Amino acid sequence: AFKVNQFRKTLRHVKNIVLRRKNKERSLYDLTDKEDNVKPKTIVFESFGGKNYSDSPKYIYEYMQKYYPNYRYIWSFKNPDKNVVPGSAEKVKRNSAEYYQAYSEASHWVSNARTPLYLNKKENQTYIQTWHGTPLKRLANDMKVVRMPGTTTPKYKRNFNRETSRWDYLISPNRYSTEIFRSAFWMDEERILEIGYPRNDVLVNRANDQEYLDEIRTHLNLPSDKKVIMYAPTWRDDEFVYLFELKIDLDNLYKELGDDYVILLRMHYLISNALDLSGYENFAIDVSNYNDVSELFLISDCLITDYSSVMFDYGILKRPQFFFAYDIDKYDKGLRGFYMNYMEDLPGPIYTEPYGLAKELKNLDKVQQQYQEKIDAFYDRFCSVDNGKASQYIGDLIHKDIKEQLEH
Q: Judge residue 30's burial from the number of C-beta atoms within 10 Å of its C-beta, 0-12 exposed, 13-18 middle, 19 or more buried.
A: buried
Give the C-alpha separation, 166 to 391, whole Å: 21
Helix, coil or strand: residue 107: strand
Is residue 41 close enough to count as binding Cl ion by CB under 5 A?
yes
Is residue 241 close enough to count as binding a second copy by CB under 8 A?
no
Centroid of chain to Cα 5: 36
- State in angstroms the smallest separation of the CB of 206 from Cl ion: 19
Helix (H) or strand (E) run with residue 232 in it: strand 227-232
384 has binding-site annotation: no
Is residue 151 close enough to count as binding a second copy by CB under 8 A?
yes
Q: In what order do the strands lie in the sheet with 90-93?
A: 90-93, 72-77, 39-46, 106-111, 126-129, 169-172, 192-194
Q: CB under 5 to 8 A by kind: which of a second copy, Cl ion, none does 263 bind?
A: none
Q: Which CB, 4 or 241, lies closer to a second copy?
A: 4
309 has binding-site annotation: yes
Is residue 113 close enough to count as binding Cl ion by CB under 5 A?
yes
Site map 369..408 versus Cl ion, x via CB under 5 A = ------------x---------------------------
Q: CB under 5 to 8 A by kind: which of Cl ion, a second copy, none does 32 bind?
A: a second copy
Site map 15..34 versus a second copy, x via CB under 8 A = x-xxx--------x--xx-x
Q: Which residue from 34, 70, 190, 365 is in contact with Cl ion, where contact means CB under 5 A?
A: 70
- State in angstroms the smallest separation of the CB of 90 from a second copy: 21
Q: Please tell me the count of residues contacting Cl ion according to CB under 5 A.
A: 34
φ, ψ dihedrals at 360, nearest 5°: -55, -50
Stretch in the footprint of a second copy (CB under 8 A) among 2-10, 106-114, 229-237, 304-312: 2-10
Side chain identity at residue 299, one-letter code: I
268 has binding-site annotation: yes
Q: Judge residue 204's burial from the number of C-beta atoms within 10 Å of its C-beta, 0-12 exposed, 13-18 middle, 19 or more buried.
A: middle
Is residue 159 close enough to count as binding a second copy by CB under 8 A?
no
Query: Is 368 in contact with 349 (CB distance < 8 Å)?
Result: no
Query: Is 266 in contact with 231 (CB distance < 8 Å)?
Result: yes
Give the C-alpha separation, 134 to 113, whole Å: 13
R_g of the chain computed on alpha carbons:
23
Is residue 159 close enough to count as binding Cl ion by CB under 5 A?
yes
Binding residues for a second copy, per CB under 8 A? 1-4, 6-8, 10-11, 13-15, 17-19, 28, 31-32, 34, 145, 147, 149-155
- Please enumerate, by residue number, every residue annotated as part of a binding site for CDP-glycerol: 131-135, 199, 233-234, 266-268, 308-309, 313
- Please enumerate, by residue number, every residue annotated as part of a binding site: 131-135, 199, 233-234, 266-268, 308-309, 313
